[PDB]
C-alpha cells in the first residue's frame, strides 16, 4: 500500500502543533 503512507501525513499535523507552543 503506497497510499497508506498518505494517511500518515495526517500525523504530521501534530508536529506543526509543537511549533504552536
mmCIF file of N, CA, C and O in Angstrom:
data_model
loop_
_atom_site.group_PDB
_atom_site.id
_atom_site.type_symbol
_atom_site.label_atom_id
_atom_site.label_comp_id
_atom_site.label_asym_id
_atom_site.label_seq_id
_atom_site.Cartn_x
_atom_site.Cartn_y
_atom_site.Cartn_z
ATOM 1 N N UNK A 1 0.840 -1.185 0.000
ATOM 2 C CA UNK A 1 0.000 0.000 0.000
ATOM 3 C C UNK A 1 0.885 1.248 0.000
ATOM 4 O O UNK A 1 1.616 1.495 0.959
ATOM 5 N N UNK A 2 0.791 2.003 -1.085
ATOM 6 C CA UNK A 2 1.574 3.218 -1.222
ATOM 7 C C UNK A 2 0.783 4.397 -0.652
ATOM 8 O O UNK A 2 1.343 5.255 0.028
ATOM 9 N N UNK A 3 -0.509 4.401 -0.951
ATOM 10 C CA UNK A 3 -1.383 5.460 -0.477
ATOM 11 C C UNK A 3 -1.650 5.320 1.023
ATOM 12 O O UNK A 3 -2.347 6.145 1.613
ATOM 13 N N UNK A 4 -1.083 4.269 1.597
ATOM 14 C CA UNK A 4 -1.252 4.010 3.017
ATOM 15 C C UNK A 4 -0.394 4.988 3.822
ATOM 16 O O UNK A 4 -0.663 5.234 4.996
ATOM 17 N N UNK A 5 0.622 5.519 3.159
ATOM 18 C CA UNK A 5 1.521 6.465 3.798
ATOM 19 C C UNK A 5 0.953 7.884 3.744
ATOM 20 O O UNK A 5 1.389 8.759 4.491
ATOM 21 N N UNK A 6 -0.012 8.068 2.855
ATOM 22 C CA UNK A 6 -0.644 9.366 2.695
ATOM 23 C C UNK A 6 -1.535 9.675 3.900
ATOM 24 O O UNK A 6 -1.846 10.835 4.166
ATOM 25 N N UNK A 7 -1.920 8.616 4.597
ATOM 26 C CA UNK A 7 -2.770 8.760 5.768
ATOM 27 C C UNK A 7 -1.903 9.100 6.982
ATOM 28 O O UNK A 7 -2.404 9.611 7.983
ATOM 29 N N UNK A 8 -0.618 8.805 6.853
ATOM 30 C CA UNK A 8 0.323 9.074 7.928
ATOM 31 C C UNK A 8 0.693 10.559 7.940
ATOM 32 O O UNK A 8 1.169 11.075 8.949
ATOM 33 N N UNK A 9 0.460 11.203 6.806
ATOM 34 C CA UNK A 9 0.762 12.618 6.673
ATOM 35 C C UNK A 9 -0.144 13.426 7.603
ATOM 36 O O UNK A 9 0.173 14.562 7.953
ATOM 37 N N UNK A 10 -1.256 12.808 7.978
ATOM 38 C CA UNK A 10 -2.211 13.457 8.860
ATOM 39 C C UNK A 10 -1.608 13.568 10.262
ATOM 40 O O UNK A 10 -2.027 14.409 11.056
ATOM 41 N N UNK A 11 -0.635 12.708 10.524
ATOM 42 C CA UNK A 11 0.030 12.700 11.816
ATOM 43 C C UNK A 11 1.153 13.738 11.842
ATOM 44 O O UNK A 11 1.772 13.963 12.881
ATOM 45 N N UNK A 12 1.384 14.342 10.685
ATOM 46 C CA UNK A 12 2.423 15.351 10.562
ATOM 47 C C UNK A 12 1.867 16.713 10.983
ATOM 48 O O UNK A 12 2.625 17.662 11.182
ATOM 49 N N UNK A 13 0.550 16.766 11.107
ATOM 50 C CA UNK A 13 -0.116 17.996 11.500
ATOM 51 C C UNK A 13 0.102 18.233 12.996
ATOM 52 O O UNK A 13 0.028 19.368 13.466
ATOM 53 N N UNK A 14 0.365 17.143 13.703
ATOM 54 C CA UNK A 14 0.593 17.218 15.135
ATOM 55 C C UNK A 14 1.980 17.795 15.425
ATOM 56 O O UNK A 14 2.215 18.342 16.502
ATOM 57 N N UNK A 15 2.861 17.653 14.447
ATOM 58 C CA UNK A 15 4.219 18.153 14.584
ATOM 59 C C UNK A 15 4.213 19.676 14.438
ATOM 60 O O UNK A 15 5.072 20.359 14.992
ATOM 61 N N UNK A 16 3.234 20.163 13.689
ATOM 62 C CA UNK A 16 3.106 21.593 13.464
ATOM 63 C C UNK A 16 2.551 22.273 14.717
ATOM 64 O O UNK A 16 2.734 23.474 14.909
ATOM 65 N N UNK A 17 1.884 21.475 15.538
ATOM 66 C CA UNK A 17 1.300 21.984 16.767
ATOM 67 C C UNK A 17 2.379 22.227 17.826
ATOM 68 O O UNK A 17 2.181 23.016 18.748
ATOM 69 N N UNK A 18 3.494 21.533 17.657
ATOM 70 C CA UNK A 18 4.604 21.662 18.586
ATOM 71 C C UNK A 18 5.226 23.053 18.442
ATOM 72 O O UNK A 18 5.747 23.608 19.408
ATOM 73 N N UNK A 19 5.150 23.576 17.226
ATOM 74 C CA UNK A 19 5.699 24.891 16.942
ATOM 75 C C UNK A 19 4.699 25.991 17.299
ATOM 76 O O UNK A 19 4.994 27.176 17.148
ATOM 77 N N UNK A 20 3.536 25.561 17.766
ATOM 78 C CA UNK A 20 2.490 26.495 18.147
ATOM 79 C C UNK A 20 2.651 26.860 19.624
ATOM 80 O O UNK A 20 2.188 27.912 20.060
ATOM 81 N N UNK A 21 3.309 25.970 20.352
ATOM 82 C CA UNK A 21 3.536 26.186 21.771
ATOM 83 C C UNK A 21 4.611 27.250 21.999
ATOM 84 O O UNK A 21 4.428 28.410 21.636
#
